[PDB]
Amino acid sequence: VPLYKQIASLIEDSIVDGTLSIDQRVPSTNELAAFHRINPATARNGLTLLVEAGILYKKRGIGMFVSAQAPALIRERRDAAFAATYVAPLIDESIHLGFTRARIHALLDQVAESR
């Protein structure tokens, strides 16, 4: 995983854990660069990634802040990544193999009951 992504995820984690709130300045490119001791452009790319997702917003002349719906955004995105990565190919292959809805649901239970 690229460093700008690792930085972005650390910030989301802080938002999920509740250690970073809504009216709390987010560490700046310069502050993140100094702390994690990484390249500024890397910290920047991480922050921008969160902007483009609607998780952070710029308060003119003050700094970066957290959107109130950030928690919902991180949760919804991670849930969608989960569905596409783990459920989408499962369903596609089910159709390919010709399984019925009942068969797939039974397979799920059969595996859960027998790990």
Distance of closest approach, residue 6 Cβ to a second copy, in angstroms? 19
What amino acid occupies position 11? I
Toward a second copy, which CB reaches closer, 16 or 38? 16
Distance of closest approach, residue 111 Cβ to a second copy, in angstroms? 5
Toward a second copy, which CB reaches closer, 6 or 85? 85
Distance of closest approach, residue 63 Cβ to a second copy, in angstroms? 32
The DSSP symbol for 26 reads B
Please give the residue ranges that form the binding site for a second copy (CB under 8 A). 79, 82-83, 85-95, 97, 101, 104-105, 107-112, 115
Query: Using CB atoms within 10 A of its CB, is residue 96 exposed (0-12), middle (13-18) or buried (19+)?
Result: exposed
Please answer whether residues 54 and 67 qualify as being in contact, where contact means their C-beta atoms are separated by less than 8 angstroms: yes
- CB atoms under 10 Å from CB of 38, counted, come to 16
Toward a second copy, which CB reaches closer, 61 or 98? 98
